[PDB]
Amino acid sequence: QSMSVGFIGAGQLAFALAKGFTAAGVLAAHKIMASSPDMDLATVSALRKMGVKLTPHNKETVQHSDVLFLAVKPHIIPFILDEIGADIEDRHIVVSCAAGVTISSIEKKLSAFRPAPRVIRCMTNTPVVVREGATVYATGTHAQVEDGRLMEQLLSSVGFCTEVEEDLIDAVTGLSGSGPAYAFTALDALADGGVKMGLPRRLAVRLGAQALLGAAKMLLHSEQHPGQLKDNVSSPGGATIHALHVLESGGFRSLLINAVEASCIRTRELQSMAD
């Protein structure tokens, strides 16, 4: 491959993807360049230790890169496209990770400079850092068929990856983009429950995380409905069905629906705030 990768933005997601790509062996750390207006972030220091090249100049990242990731906050994307739009070349694939930012808005900015910018919109999540990410992407107007395939090969090296229509990406954000945070909240609470019932905290954290990992893997490897797996686990009169009742009495299911909806709706607002 010998592909050169750039990140405009050096935050948590740029660090997670760089760490994933290098652990996967797809990219040498020193073939990645990242830029940031704030060179004093801790994520910048971890990238530096990894061997990723760092610069304060977004133009240098663009000129270095073959595949260019836009890993900045959604409201910063239009100022970035103005700043380095003249430096995007025909050889570039521009991959936007910003939540809610549409392919159309990016192409409208970039097309004022060169006529056929190759744009891909991505929604991924922090577990790419352990090569278990969940990624979807949509291809832009001028993205070649080989561009989508390259993107899927690259993002599949750090987790699940699949092409979607762009109009699903805001909902994906609410589910798997924000999802790891729902899981971290759940794991902290489950550990608190283990401690309340007499477990040492260290063991309770380990057991809860292992339970959630195992259950998620069971579901991915099963063709059965999660309600069926739940039924298979709950013996009559037993401990599990008693616990499931108290979850139901609190509306546990509805809270998770509320969360996916709230994150999706906010993502749609971030873009309406832009346009």
Ligand X SMILES: O=C(O)c1ccc(Br)c(C(=O)O)c1
Q: Which of residues 253-272 bind its own copies (CB under 8 A)?
A: 253-267, 270
Which of 205, 272, 274, 275 is in the footprint of its own copies by CB under 8 A? Answer: 205
> From the CB of 20, what's the least distance to its own copies, in Å?
10
232 a known binding residue? yes
User: What backbone phi and psi angles, to 5 degrees, belong to 10?
Assistant: -130, 40
Residues 95-154 binding ligand X (CB under 6 A) are 99, 125
For the chain, how far is it from start to end, CA to CA, in angstroms? 38
Which of 235, 249, 272, 275 is in the footprint of ligand X by CB under 6 A? Answer: 235
Q: Which is nearer to ligand X, 9 or 85 (CB)?
A: 9
Q: Can residue 237 be called a binding residue for its own copies (CB under 8 A)?
A: yes
Which of 177, 191, 208, 264 is in the footprint of ligand X by CB under 6 A? Answer: 177
105 a known binding residue? no
Q: Can residue 206 be called a binding residue for its own copies (CB under 8 A)?
A: yes
Residues 155-174 binding ligand X (CB under 6 A) are 173
- Burial of residue 27 (number of CB atoms within 10 Å: 0-12, 13-18, 19+): buried
- Options 60-68, 83-91, 111-119, 120-128: segment touching its own copies (CB under 8 A): 120-128
Closest residue by Cα to residue 53 from 36, 28, 33? 33
- Cα distances (angstroms) measured from residue 264 to each of 1, 10, 77, 252, 259: 36, 24, 19, 19, 8
Q: Can residue 43 be called a binding residue for ligand X (CB under 6 A)?
A: no
Kindly report the length of the chain: 275
Q: What's the rounded Cα separation, in Å, for the pair 265 and 171?
A: 8
Which of 56, 108, 112, 252 is in the footprint of its own copies by CB under 8 A? Answer: 252
User: What backbone phi and psi angles, to 5 degrees, belong to 68?
Assistant: -120, 115
Q: Which is nearer to its own copies, 3 or 46 (CB)?
A: 46
Q: Which is nearer to ligand X, 144 or 232 (CB)?
A: 232
Q: What's the rounded Cα separation, in Å, for the pair 181 and 125?
A: 10
Tokens for 183, please give them.
């899981």
In what order do the strands lie in the sheet containing 5-8?
53-55, 32-35, 5-8, 67-70, 93-96, 118-123, 133-139, 159-163
Which of 101, 136, 143, 151 is in the footprint of its own copies by CB under 8 A? Answer: 136
Closest residue by Cα to residue 55 from 37, 70, 79? 37
Closest residue by Cα to residue 170 from 93, 269, 81? 269
Which of ligand X, its own copies, none lies near 133, with the C-beta cut-off 5 to 8 A by kind? its own copies
Q: Which is nearer to ligand X, 88 or 120 (CB)?
A: 120
> From the CB of 64, what's the least distance to its own copies, in Å?
25
Binding residues for NADPH: 10, 12-13, 36, 38, 58, 72-73, 99, 232
Site residues, ligand X (CB under 6 A): 99, 125, 173, 177-178, 233-235, 238-240
Binding residues for L-proline: 166, 239-240
